[PDB]
Ligand binder design. Sequence first.
Ligand SMILES: *P(O)(O)(O)OC[C@@H](COC(=O)CCC)OC(=O)CCC
Length: 493
Amino acid sequence: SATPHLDAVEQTLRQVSPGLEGDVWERTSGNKLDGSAADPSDWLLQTPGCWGDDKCADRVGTKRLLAKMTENIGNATRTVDISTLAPFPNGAFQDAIVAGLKESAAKGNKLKVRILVGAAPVIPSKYRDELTAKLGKAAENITLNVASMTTSKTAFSWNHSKILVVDGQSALTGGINSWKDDYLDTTHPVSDVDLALTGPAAGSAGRYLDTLWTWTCQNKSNIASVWFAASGNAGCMPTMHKDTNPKASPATGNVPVIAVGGLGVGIKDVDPKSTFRPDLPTASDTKCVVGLHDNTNADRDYDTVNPEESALRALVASAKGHIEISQQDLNATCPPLPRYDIRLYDALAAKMAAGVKVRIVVSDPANRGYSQIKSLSEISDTLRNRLANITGGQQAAKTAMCSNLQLATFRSSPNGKWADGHPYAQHHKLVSVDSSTFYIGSKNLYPSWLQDFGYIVESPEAAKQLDAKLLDPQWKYSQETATVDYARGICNA
Ligand SMILES: *P(O)(O)(O)OC[C@@H](COC(=O)CCC)OC(=O)CCC
């Protein structure tokens, strides 16, 4: 096959969540990574994009991100569909949205617009009002829905997806919250990444948002769950995408993609079509407390409505050669979450045991918002213990780990910290395998029970672009913090 990695992932998803195929996950063909003619890699919307400079003077990544948001929105003829994590977009993120809506309205277009945020159980009516004011005359052309939502207080579940879909044709998604203080007006900007694509896979994002809004609209009268606000006398629009855009978006290229999300907890309890029978592993050091119900490691029905967890574990399991992971964290704070995803660590262990190389770059523990560990040993100890189950013991585990692991914290320049003295915060949710297939989205690899979304793309060209523009510069600067680095014989773990 031309797509051995997506083929494997797809086969897993059809066993895990068959009743969600089309809505919460979907394989499509005919997509394009949406880069410029001058710089074809600039579909990769990294931020800040200031490699080598501890002052972050020339933020070529931020500039391109904000420009691309406005470009895509400004090309709208029918719909604009946005999700993110609260707070609502502010600063130049909000400026970019407003500029795009005005651009589209001046071209004579009448738009439907949804903006959904997940929140701890902010104020939609105020954001609607702020936006309507800033739109000016353009607001005459726009039907707006704005909502904040919480799906489960006790499982800590709410939207965490960060999506911008225009006309079902273009989509930007990734880890980037639209938070000016963390990303923009700061001399220690968070490092993160979105991608830009067009094609049928953008339609997949639209159908995922219809799923979230269908729940949101159904619960709009429940005060503990949803705060909703619309323009004019407009109603809640649960199926804006299905109602307004083609069931299949137009093809724009030849890139194959799996779109995959999750429903968290409190939307749907199980996929009743699923006959998934997982082999669930055991461990004594993930569930820190006996009271905790562990959805990540011990709830079959949870997996069936959260295909993304399985998709990420299958993407790791597909690797023949090498895996690069860039995350805020691999481990979560317990309670209320378990410390780690056993199956994911077991998948990484299986790969190292077979000589497949694994690089994990996480955020510096000095950030502990943007870190949940005290030391890289909380990751290496765990990988070692899981390797021990399949290599015959602790010594042979340590050897397999030291021979096949790169483990480090993130820097973007020679300096251990930004020049203002703040540690580098990293927030990517990135996995790449074999210079071939990669995930960019909102789903963290640490235990998390939220609504999330992302794309798995099988395109060696784009993955090599990803290498050049992001992973290579990352490892250039980050390798100096490594506790384990097989490429240099370092093994301080
Ligand atoms: P993400 O990867 O930073 O954008 O968020 C995951 C993170 C924070 O979620 C929140 O909602 C923080 C409150 C606004 O992890 C959690 O889910 C912890 C929840 C407090």
